[PDB]
Design a protein around this ligand. Structure first.
Ligand code: HEM
Length: 291
C-alpha cells in the first residue's frame, strides 16, 4: 500500500495558515483545560499517537488515513484522554471541512509545538482519509513500564534511531501523566505548556526515587513533584541514550532542530510525496503575525 499525498483541491499555504491560526487562537482561548495546562500537550500527543501506529514493514497505520476518527482506534486504551484533543479540533474541522483528518491531527501537533514556543516544524499537506477497515488494531503504541531495549526496539518499527528517539521523547516536557488515563501520575517538570529542553535537564539533575503510584505502578518521582516513566528513565540507564540526553540538556538549539526533524518525520512516515508536491510549509505563529 502506497499512500500518495494529494493536496486538498485548490488549497495552498494560505489556506493551511488559516487552519493553523484557528487552532492557535482556540489554544489561546480554551486555556482552562487540564488545570490550566491548556490543550497544547494533548494535541501534540494526538499528533504522535495518530502517526505512531505506523509499521514500516507494510505501511499500515500512520498519519495518512486519519483513522483515529474510527471507534477501534479512538477507543484504544493507549489513546485514553486523546478524545479531548479530538473534541478541541472538532469546531476547527467544522470551519474548515475541506482539510483531511490526518492533515488536521498532524497540523494540530505542529501548531501546538510552535504556539508553545517550540521549534518551527515544517509541515506538508496531502493526507487523504481512508476507510474504517484501514484502521490499525490496538496495541501498536508503546508501553511505559519497559526498559531501554524495549524502547529502542519499539522505535525501529517507526524507523527511528537513537537520536530520533531521544529527541522525540523531549516532548515529555509537556503536559502530564494522569492516573486514570495511563496508570501514571504527575508532570515531568515545571514548564509543561512551554516547549523547552527541560525533560533532559530534569532527568539528569533531579534526585529520582523509584516509587509506586496509587495504581500500583512504579514510576520515578522527585521531591520537586516531578515524575518520569520507566521508559523515560531508561534514557539515562542506557549509555547510548544517556550521551544524547546530555547533549540536549546542554544545547537547546540542537534539541529544537533535532526534534523538528524527527517530529516532521514521524508525522510523514508512510506518505509518498510526488516530485511536484508543494514544498513543506512553515507556518507563522500568531505572535509572528501580530495576532
Ligand atoms: C516509549 C515512548 C513513549 C511512551 C511509553 C509514552 C508514554 C506516555 C504516557 C504513559 C503518557 C501519559 C498519558 C496520560 O496519563 O495522560 C504520555 C503523555 C504524553 N506523551 Fe508520551 N510516551 C512516549 C513517547 C512520546 C512521544 C514520542 C511523544 C511525542 C513526540 C510523546 C508526547 C506526549 C505528550 C505531549 C504527553 C502529555 C499528554 C497530556 O498532557 O495530555 N510521548 N506519554
Amino acid at each position: 500500500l502506497v499512500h500518495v499525498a494529494s493536496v486538498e483541491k485548490g488549497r495552498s499555504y494560505e489556506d493551511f495558515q488559516k487552519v493553523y491560526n484557528a487552532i492557535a487562537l482556540k489554544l489561546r482561548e480554551d486555556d482552562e483545560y487540564d488545570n490550566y495546562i491548556g490543550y497544547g500537550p494533548v494535541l501534540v500527543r494526538l499528533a504522535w499517537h495518530t502517526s505512531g501506529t505506523w509499521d514500516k514493514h507494510d505501511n499500515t497505520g500512520g498519519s495518512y488515513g486519519g483513522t483515529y476518527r474510527f471507534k477501534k482506534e479512538f477507543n484504544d486504551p493507549s489513546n485514553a484522554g486523546l478524545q479531548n484533543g479530538f473534541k478541541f479540533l472538532e469546531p476547527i474541522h467544522k470551519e474548515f471541512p475541506w482539510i483531511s483528518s490526518g492533515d488536521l491531527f498532524s497540523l494540530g501537533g505542529v501548531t501546538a509545538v510552535q504556539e508553545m514556543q517550540g521549534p518551527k516544524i515544517p509541515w506538508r499537506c496531502g493526507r487523504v482519509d481512508t476507510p474504517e477497515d484501514t484502521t490499525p488494531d490496538n496495541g501498536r503504541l508503546p508501553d511505559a513500564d519497559k526498559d531501554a531495549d524495549y524502547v529502542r526496539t519499539f522505535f525501529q518499527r517507526l524507523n527511528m534511531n537513537d537520536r530520533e528517539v531521544v529527541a522525540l521523547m523531549g516532548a515529555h516536557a509537556l503536559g502530564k501523566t494522569h492516573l486514570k488515563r495511563s496508570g501514571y501520575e504527575g508532570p515531568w517538570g515545571a514548564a509543561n505548556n512551554v516547549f523547552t529542553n527541560e525533560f533532559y535537564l530534569n532527568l539528569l539533575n533531579e534526585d529520582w526515587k523509584l516509587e509506586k503510584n496509587d495504581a500500583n505502578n512504579e514510576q520515578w518521582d522527585s521531591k520537586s513533584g516531578y515524575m518520569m516513566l520507566p521508559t523515560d528513565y531508561s534514557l539515562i540507564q542506557d549509555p547510548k541514550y544517556l550521551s544524547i540526553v546530555k547533549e540536549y540538556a546542554n544545547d537547546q538549539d540542537k534539541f529544537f532542530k533535532d526534534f523538528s526533524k524527527a517530529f516532521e518525520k514521524l508525522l510523514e512516515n508512510g506518505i509518498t510525496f510526488p516530485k511536484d508536491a508543494p514544498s513543506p510549509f512553515i507556518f507563522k505563529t500568531l505572535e509572528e503575525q501580530g495576532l
